[PDB]
Amino acid sequence: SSKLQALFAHPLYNVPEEPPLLGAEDSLLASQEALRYYRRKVARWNRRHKMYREQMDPPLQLRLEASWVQFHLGINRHGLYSRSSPVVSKLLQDMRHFPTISADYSQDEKALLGACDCTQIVKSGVHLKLVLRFSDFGKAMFKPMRQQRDEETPVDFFYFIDFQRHNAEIAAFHLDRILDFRRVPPTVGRIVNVTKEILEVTKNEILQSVFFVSPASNVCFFAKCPYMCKTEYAVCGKPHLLEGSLSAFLPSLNLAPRLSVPNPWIRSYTLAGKEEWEVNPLYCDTVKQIYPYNNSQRLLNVIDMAIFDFLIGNMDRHHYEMFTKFGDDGFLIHLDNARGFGRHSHDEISILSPLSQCCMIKKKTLLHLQLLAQADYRLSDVMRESLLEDQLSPVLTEPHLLALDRRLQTILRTVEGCIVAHGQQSVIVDG
Amino acid sequence: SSKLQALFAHPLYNVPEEPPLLGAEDSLLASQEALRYYRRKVARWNRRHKMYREQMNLTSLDPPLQLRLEASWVQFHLGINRHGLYSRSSPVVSKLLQDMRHFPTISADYSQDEKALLGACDCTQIVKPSGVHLKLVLRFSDFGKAMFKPMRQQRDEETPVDFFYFIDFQRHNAEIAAFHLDRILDFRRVPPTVGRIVNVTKEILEVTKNEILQSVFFVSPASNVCFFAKCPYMCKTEYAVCGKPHLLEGSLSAFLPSLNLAPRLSVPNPWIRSYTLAGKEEWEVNPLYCDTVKQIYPYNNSQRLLNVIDMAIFDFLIGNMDRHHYEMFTKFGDDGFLIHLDNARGFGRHSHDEISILSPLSQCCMIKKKTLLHLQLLAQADYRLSDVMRESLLEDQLSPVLTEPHLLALDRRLQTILRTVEGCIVAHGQQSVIVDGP
Ligand SMILES: *[C@@H]1O[C@H](CO)[C@@H](O[C@@H]2O[C@H](CO)[C@@H](O)[C@H](O)[C@H]2NC(C)=O)[C@H](O)[C@H]1NC(C)=O
Ligand SMILES: *[C@@H]1O[C@H](CO)[C@@H](O[C@@H]2O[C@H](CO)[C@@H](O)[C@H](O)[C@H]2NC(C)=O)[C@H](O)[C@H]1NC(C)=O
Ligand SMILES: *[C@@H]1O[C@H](CO)[C@@H](O[C@@H]2O[C@H](CO)[C@@H](O)[C@H](O)[C@H]2NC(C)=O)[C@H](O)[C@H]1NC(C)=O
Ligand SMILES: *[C@@H]1O[C@H](CO)[C@@H](O)[C@H](O)[C@H]1NC(C)=O
Numbered sequence A: 001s002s003k004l005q006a007l008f009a010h011p012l013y014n015v016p017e018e019p020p021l022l023g024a025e026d027s028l029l030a031s032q033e034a035l036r037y038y039r040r041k042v043a044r045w046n047r048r049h050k051m052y053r054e055q056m057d058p059p060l061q062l063r064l065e066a067s068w069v070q071f072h073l074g075i076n077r078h079g080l081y082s083r084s085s086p087v088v089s090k091l092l093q094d095m096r097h098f099p100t101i102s103a104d105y106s107q108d109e110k111a112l113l114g115a116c117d118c119t120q121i122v123k124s125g126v127h128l129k130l131v132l133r134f135s136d137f138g139k140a141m142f143k144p145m146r147q148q149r150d151e152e153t154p155v156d157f158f159y160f161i162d163f164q165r166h167n168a169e170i171a172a173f174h175l176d177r178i179l180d181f182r183r184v185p186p187t188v189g190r191i192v193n194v195t196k197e198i199l200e201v202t203k204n205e206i207l208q209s210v211f212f213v214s215p216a217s218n219v220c221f222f223a224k225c226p227y228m229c230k231t232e233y234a235v236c237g238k239p240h241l242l243e244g245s246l247s248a249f250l251p252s253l254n255l256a257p258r259l260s261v262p263n264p265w266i267r268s269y270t271l272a273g274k275e276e277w278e279v280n281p282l283y284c285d286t287v288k289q290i291y292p293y294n295n296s297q298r299l300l301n302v303i304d305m306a307i308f309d310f311l312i313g314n315m316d317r318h319h320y321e322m323f324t325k326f327g328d329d330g331f332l333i334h335l336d337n338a339r340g341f342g343r344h345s346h347d348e349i350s351i352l353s354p355l356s357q358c359c360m361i362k363k364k365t366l367l368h369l370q371l372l373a374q375a376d377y378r379l380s381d382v383m384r385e386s387l388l389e390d391q392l393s394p395v396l397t398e399p400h401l402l403a404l405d406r407r408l409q410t411i412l413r414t415v416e417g418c419i420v421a422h423g424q425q426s427v428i429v430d431g
Numbered sequence B: 001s002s003k004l005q006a007l008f009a010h011p012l013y014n015v016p017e018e019p020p021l022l023g024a025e026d027s028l029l030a031s032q033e034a035l036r037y038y039r040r041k042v043a044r045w046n047r048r049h050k051m052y053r054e055q056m057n058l059t060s061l062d063p064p065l066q067l068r069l070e071a072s073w074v075q076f077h078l079g080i081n082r083h084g085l086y087s088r089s090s091p092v093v094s095k096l097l098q099d100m101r102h103f104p105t106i107s108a109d110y111s112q113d114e115k116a117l118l119g120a121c122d123c124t125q126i127v128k129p130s131g132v133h134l135k136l137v138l139r140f141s142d143f144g145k146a147m148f149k150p151m152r153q154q155r156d157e158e159t160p161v162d163f164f165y166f167i168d169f170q171r172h173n174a175e176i177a178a179f180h181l182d183r184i185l186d187f188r189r190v191p192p193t194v195g196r197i198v199n200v201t202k203e204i205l206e207v208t209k210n211e212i213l214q215s216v217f218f219v220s221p222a223s224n225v226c227f228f229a230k231c232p233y234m235c236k237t238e239y240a241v242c243g244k245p246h247l248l249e250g251s252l253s254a255f256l257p258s259l260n261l262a263p264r265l266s267v268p269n270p271w272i273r274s275y276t277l278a279g280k281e282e283w284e285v286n287p288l289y290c291d292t293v294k295q296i297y298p299y300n301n302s303q304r305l306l307n308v309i310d311m312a313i314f315d316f317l318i319g320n321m322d323r324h325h326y327e328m329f330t331k332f333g334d335d336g337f338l339i340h341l342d343n344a345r346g347f348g349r350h351s352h353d354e355i356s357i358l359s360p361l362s363q364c365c366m367i368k369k370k371t372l373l374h375l376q377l378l379a380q381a382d383y384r385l386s387d388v389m390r391e392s393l394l395e396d397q398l399s400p401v402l403t404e405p406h407l408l409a410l411d412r413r414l415q416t417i418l419r420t421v422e423g424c425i426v427a428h429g430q431q432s433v434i435v436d437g438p
Helices: A003-009 A031-055 A067-074 A086-097 A165-179 A194-199 A205-209 A224-228 A282-287 A296-312 A349-358 A363-372 A379-387 A398-422 B003-009 B031-055 B072-079 B091-102 B171-185 B200-205 B211-215 B230-234 B288-293 B302-318 B355-364 B369-378 B385-393 B404-428
Strands: A100-105 A130-134 A139-144 A187-193 A211-213 A219-222 A234-236 A241-248 A258-262 A319-323 B105-109 B136-140 B145-150 B193-199 B217-219 B225-228 B240-242 B247-254 B264-268 B325-329
Touching (some): A031 A067, A067 A086, A100 A205, A165 A241, A165 A296, A165 A363, A282 A349, A363 A398, B003 B385, B171 B193, B171 B302, B171 B369, B193 B200, B302 B355, B302 B404, B369 B404, B385 B404
Antiparallel strands (some): A139 A241, A219 A234, A258 A319, B193 B247, B264 B325
16 A cells, blocks of 8 residues: 555554643734735735836735644644644645746845845855745745756865755655655745746836856846855756746744744864763753753754754754743754755764763664664655655655665664663653 | 964974966956955945035044955955965965954944844744853954954843853864964964954944944943843843943954855855764764765865865864854866855864864864874974964953963864864775875
8 A cells, every 4th residue: 555645544644642732822924814914915015016017917816724824823832733634735836836926035044135146145055046926825945956067166065065955855855744744844846937926026126137048048046246256156957847846934033033043953063082072961951951941842943953953964953943932841843955955975973962972862863763773664765755745756766765764763762772771761751 | 482483483384385376367357357356445435425414413523434455354355265275375465464454444334244134033943052242343444344243241140041151152263273274283273363442433423324333332321331132131031241331352354255255155064964873883983974975076075075074174273063054266167265254163172172173074084184193293392382382372352362271272182183084094004095286
């Protein structure tokens, strides 16, 4: 049969989560306050669109049944979305097929225009990404596939280039759903007509002016400051179609503010020989006494994030984000996973340092990992099966999929080492 | 006597550098092209100053400003050449250090990279590492500009999002000490930097024309003068510094030439991260990575890799794990020297040595003859590195810049560098390790 189907039909993936949601205080957004805010933004956009089109059709209406609207209203204390959620399935399909009505630069990149300084340009930064708006007024971050070879980007160092960038965003969401972490925004691949769906729908004159026709008769747009800095500066359709990743927008920071928190294990340190850094508990013994890691949930949430990052080989989680409303102990949002799935033949166990030093793990997390190590629910099999739904299938080649099984075994062997040293009662925390 | 004096009187610190400078093509700026550009900026600044002083109703007292060629910062810019930012035993640098330390200010503003983050507050672009928020760019009476980084004052209880062991407590001391070590090592690759106790009321608030910077000044409940950053405050990170009640200590770093006159490139550091190799070969000892980097442009040419190895030695000595990128001048091409900017993350742990920073040296096993000779000399008792550093730092207004543990760690890390070179020589011989210069 189907291992992916077997996984979500398994009793483990149907256990109700504790504590059950108590309605109001457990949801991110207040429905009535958020809906009137979205209705004002829609009226704003229709006002902008009416004046623009007159300078050169019926208006847009905010429909409550839109996928992204239910997505935002579905965000609660237990994660970004629900397990086996039909709303998520519809949102993935909507992002893949709905036409676009507007396109612009990301807000953080409108600043670097520019006034070109290569310091703020060669920072994990995807400078050719764009924000697309769909016909249902939803917004997604479009990260195009890396196309230029490093000979065209003299400043870029080969082994730091995000060649797998768009595949990594897609595969990180599917792994998030399979792990039942439910902490990264829904993400799909899409083959985009850059002429029809970007150039002809944007109101940004700067973005209009950077589009050009390649000498090879392809349609392209470029970034001026990255070109002068000799980094990645252009992507092209062939001649119109360009594949990339689309990541669903979280609610506006006006509705749900977010904090950025530094990852205390982003760096490893060479301890005085020959005690290894990932195995020595002194560092986590100190972090356990430092707010906000003194409470159990926060440290266990970071350990979840390190397991996720180890599985995808992401060494670039310098910071994690949280929603203000859920306070401490709230779940961590796993955003911007474009640096994952870059090295299938190398495992950076220093990423697992929170688990190997603190020697504690969620019971739920360990049970899901133990199940995904069994042949009937093999992580690489259910991942390969899940990624077949995407327009850019297979998204992940076989080496990356098989590396998931190897890194999963390493996580489980690490837990065994903790249990030998401290016993199951100390290691496996309950909720 | 004086060990610092003995060091620069030593024959090693008086060897002419090869190849000798050929004047024009070896200088960064063309004097006549650069001087007329500065004269236009001065005329621009005088136009704004007359017009501004009228909008806020202030009598246009005092005569206008004149671009004087003999200004320290002007000669500094014209002195930049293919061999470094400044000359060895340079009286121009000594004067520039004194001018930054004593000259009054005439204008103050935000840095351009932070004028962008005045939004639209997003904590992602605010809590990034290596970022020094609340820093300001000051303009002096001789029209020169310096980056003022104020001392970190708030404890981590006031910054709940900040992780204790990542806080830049030594931030202003690190910028100062990194320049003094740069001069003592004769790398001459970081901009001149001094400490200064600044009256934030007279020399920042009362000279700025930026209304946003004006509005963020306030009086502390303890009757201190303070200014704050709104977006960092909402992000629960470091957001305010204060005089006590007016005076605030910080670091001042001299501006490089405008990117219009001398464009710069930022290049990623291939050794910014270490990796756990499949057992049981250690990362710092395995040469395969550098064997591959040696085949990757622009590290195939000898000068570039040797310059990176110099930068790793420097970063190891000051314990800076945050050199994600290095900068170069466009005009000097690939073989040009590397600029060692933004050293605020150094000198943070006197009791730990991160040998992974030395990885380029321990993997590639090659070093400049000049670099190795200077290190060997600074390890001798008569020229002891901690002694000449302590002596050099006494010139600064914020003396002592480095406490004794940091100074003694310089000697300990120097021994590790030289003992690392010994390991390379055992494996490959002096001929392979010690490279000579063209
Ligand atoms: C991508 O979109 C462009 C523009 O909508 C399409 O090119 C147009 O094709 C029609 C005929 O089908 C012509 O009348 C237009 O003049 C064309 N415009 C341009 C700018 O060439 C293109 O066919 C689309 N490619 C797809 C859908 O694969
Ligand atoms: C973790 O530490 C924080 C702060 O140190 C605790 O939060 C508050 O701490 C102060 C004193 O440190 C108390 O007066 C408050 O009552 C605490 N807030 C509460 C209890 O909500 C926090 O409680 C610590 N974690 C745990 C599990 O106690
Ligand atoms: C720092 O600058 C302030 C502002 O110029 C100086 O304070 C001024 O001088 C005297 C001292 O209080 C007062 O009569 C003025 O009214 C002050 N002006 C303002 C705006 O407060 C101060 O003396 C300077 N030096 C120190 C050490 O604070
Ligand atoms: C380094 O490699 C580049 C490859 O483009 C070549 O042009 C250059 O001449 C090489 N220089 C040296 C010194 O090997």
